[PDB]
Amino acid sequence: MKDLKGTKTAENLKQGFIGESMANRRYLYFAKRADEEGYPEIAGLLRSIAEGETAHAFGHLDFIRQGGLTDPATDKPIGTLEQMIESAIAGETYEWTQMYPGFAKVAREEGFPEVAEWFETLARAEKSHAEKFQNVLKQLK
Amino acid sequence: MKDLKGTKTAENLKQGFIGESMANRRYLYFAKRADEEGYPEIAGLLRSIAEGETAHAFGHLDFIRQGGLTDPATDKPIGTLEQMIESAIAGETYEWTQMYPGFAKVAREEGFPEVAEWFETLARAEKSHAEKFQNVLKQLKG
Ligand SMILES: [Cl-]
Ligand SMILES: [Cl-]
Ligand SMILES: [Fe+3]
Ligand SMILES: [Fe+3]
Ligand SMILES: [Fe+3]
Ligand SMILES: [Fe+3]
Ligand SMILES: [O-]
Ligand SMILES: [O-]
C-alpha cells in the first residue's frame, strides 16, 4: 500500500495496536472473574468482545506492515516470517537483558520481594523464549 | 505489597502488562504467517509462547489489583466485577467518542482513505461494545 512513514497515521496505528492488545488481555481476565462468580452469559460476551479486539489488533498490524512501518513493540520490520522471528528475538532480548532485571532490582529496593521474585521468574522465562526463537531463525535460514 | 500506589514498581507493573499484551498479539499474528507457509512446528511454538505471555500479563494484573492499583488502560479500579465492567465502559466510550473518530479524521486528511474507513469501522464497533458492556452493568445491578 501507500508508504505511511512519517505520518501521524503511523503513530495512531501504533497506539491503536497497543490499546487493542491491552483490551483483549483485560477482557479475558475480567471473563475469568465472571466465570468464577457464575455469570456465564457475561463471561461469554466478554470472550466474544475480546475476539473483536483481536480482529482490531491484527488489522492494525496489517496496515502497519502493508504501509512499510515497523513492529510497535520493537521498531523492527515484520514483512517476512524471518523478519517476524527477528522481531520476536529482539523484544525477548530487551525483556531479559534490561527490562525485567531492572524491574526486579527496583522492587527489591522498594521493599517488595514477592514482586521481585515474579519479575526474576519472568526474566528467566523471556531468556528461554529468546533462545527458542533463535533456534527457529537458524532453522529458517 | 497491598499498597503499591505511587511507587516505581506500580509503573513497572503497568509497563510490563502493556508489553506482555502486545507480545501475545504479535506472536499469534506471526503464527498465522508460519501457518500459511507450512511451518507447523514454528507456528506451534509461537502459539505456546503466546500462552506464556498470557500468564505473564495476567500475573501483572494480579499484582496490580492486589496492590490497590488501577487498570493500565483506563486508570479506573478493577477490584470487583462491577468495577471491571465500569472500566471496560469507560475505555470503550473514550475509543468511540474521541480516539477512533480523531484517528479517522487524521487519516482522511493525510490521504489514507482505506485506513480512515478502518478507523471509522472501529469507532462504530467500540460504540457497540460500550453498549454491550452497559447492558452487562445493568444486569449486574439487577
Ligand atoms: Cl450471566
Ligand atoms: Cl515447522
Ligand atoms: Fe477494538
Ligand atoms: Fe516475552
Ligand atoms: Fe512474557
Ligand atoms: Fe474496545
Ligand atoms: O478496542
Ligand atoms: O514477554
Author numbering:
A (entry chain B): 1 to 141
B (entry chain A): 1 to 142
Authors' account:
One such protein is sulerythrin (SulE), a ruberythrin-like protein isolated from the thermophilic archeon Sulfolobus tokodaii. SulE lacks the characteristic C-terminal, rubredoxin-like FeS4 domain of ruberythrins and contains a binuclear metal centre that coordinates iron and zinc when isolated from S. tokodaii. In contrast to other members of the ruberythrin family, a crystal structure of native SulE shows that it forms homodimers through domain swapping, with each monomer contributing two α-helices to give two four-helix bundles that each harbour a solvent-accessible, single dimetal site. The exact function of SulE is unknown, but it is presumed to be involved in reactions against oxidative stress.
In order to test the effect of the total absorbed dose on SpReAD analysis, data collection at higher flux values was repeated on the same crystal used at 5% beamline flux, choosing distinct, non-overlapping positions at least 50 µm apart. Data sets at 13.5 keV and nine energies over the rising Fe K edge were collected at 10% and 100% flux. Using RADDOSE-3D, the total average diffraction-weighted dose was calculated to be 0.26 MGy for 5% flux, 0.52 MGy for 10% flux and 2.70 MGy for 100% flux. Fe-2 and Fe-4 were therefore modelled in these distinct positions, with occupancies refining to 0.32 and 0.34, respectively, for position 2 close to His129 and 0.68 and 0.66, respectively, for position 1 equivalent to that occupied in the maps calculated from data at 5% and 10% flux. The SpReAD analysis was then repeated for the data collected at 10% and 100% beamline flux, refining the f′′ contribution for each of the two Fe-2 and Fe-4 positions observed at 100% flux separately. While there was no difference in the oxidation states of all iron ions between 5% and 10% flux, at 100% flux a clear difference was visible for Fe-2 and Fe-4 at position 2, where the edge position was coincident with Fe-1 and Fe-3, suggesting that iron ions at this position are reduced. Indeed, the total dose of 2.9 MGy taken up by the crystal at 100% beamline flux is close to doses that lead to photoreduction in other metalloproteins, such as insulin or heme-containing proteins. The study presented here shows that data-collection parameters that lead to a high total absorbed dose indeed result in a partial reduction of the metal in question, and that this is not only visible in the corresponding electron density but also in the SpReAD profiles.
